[PDB]
Design a protein around this ligand. Sequence first.
Ligand SMILES: N[C@@H]1[C@@H](O)[C@H](O[C@@H]2O[C@H](CO)[C@@H](O[C@@H]3O[C@H](CO)[C@@H](O[C@@H]4O[C@H](CO)[C@@H](O[C@@H]5O[C@H](CO)[C@@H](O[C@@H]6O[C@H](CO)[C@@H](O)[C@H](O)[C@H]6N)[C@H](O)[C@H]5N)[C@H](O)[C@H]4N)[C@H](O)[C@H]3N)[C@H](O)[C@H]2N)[C@@H](CO)O[C@H]1O
Length: 241
Amino acid sequence: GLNKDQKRRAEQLTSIFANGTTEIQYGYVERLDDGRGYTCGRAGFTTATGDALEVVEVYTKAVPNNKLKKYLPELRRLAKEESDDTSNLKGFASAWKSLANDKEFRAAQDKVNDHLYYQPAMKRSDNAGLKTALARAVMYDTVIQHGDGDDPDSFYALIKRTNKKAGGSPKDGIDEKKWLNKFLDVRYDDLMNPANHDTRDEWRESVARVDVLRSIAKENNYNLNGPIHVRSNEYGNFVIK
Ligand SMILES: N[C@@H]1[C@@H](O)[C@H](O[C@@H]2O[C@H](CO)[C@@H](O[C@@H]3O[C@H](CO)[C@@H](O[C@@H]4O[C@H](CO)[C@@H](O[C@@H]5O[C@H](CO)[C@@H](O[C@@H]6O[C@H](CO)[C@@H](O)[C@H](O)[C@H]6N)[C@H](O)[C@H]5N)[C@H](O)[C@H]4N)[C@H](O)[C@H]3N)[C@H](O)[C@H]2N)[C@@H](CO)O[C@H]1O
């Protein structure tokens, strides 16, 4: 996978793309009007897509009778229905934000992120034969935004479309740097015109993350060494140690 430094750098890139800061925002909650209800915390776990529910489940297992427990029935219905409704989540956004610095709530988010995003990104990276930290970091950021579902905008759909366009994966012998450049092209195209129309407007404004990641490749920093300087017209300027 990614070593301690590389993983932190990958996460700080993802944090810039999600929140305009290298400080991971565990307390973030916002309705984006992208069909996902509330988008929350370090991964942008959402109330429509099932993963905010998982965070609250994991937190409730560790800390019974916490301030978010009462939202479980509505969160469960929202996940079942893939619903954008936030009208029956009064107080949820403020309660989530109030736990931004809570050790157990942060740990619950880290656990769900590891299970849903980091481990699947590293597993699919292994399946594709990716050897570079930068490629693995791109996969990690990609699964966070796109999810690991079965739909045409999903992480694995992007991998398969890249493999087709590139003539194979790096495991098959395709040069990993060329493959990653094609992957970034495929991801850009998906963000500009996703199959999921609800997210088209939001995702079109996120394409700058592809250029930030490509700029690391163009510096030939495939080991994701630090410091990294992000120089983005969209997000601004950042340093990542
Ligand atoms: N102009 C910039 C702005 O862009 C910027 O604003 C930020 O912009 C971000 C990008 O738009 C935005 O991010 C959103 O939030 C998160 C990412 O942080 C995204 O949310 C994810 O969306 C996925 C796709 O819908 C969801 O997918 C689901 O994933 C799960 C888990 O993998 C799948 O479940 C699996 O299913 C399989 C098969 O059934 C099964 O085998 C597995 O076991 C299951 N685990 C689902 O199938 C899948 N649908 C995902 O759950 C969800 N978390 C969202 O897409 C992003 N748009 C930021 O929020 C926004 N603030 C600002 C920043 O300051 O700057 C401006 O300048």
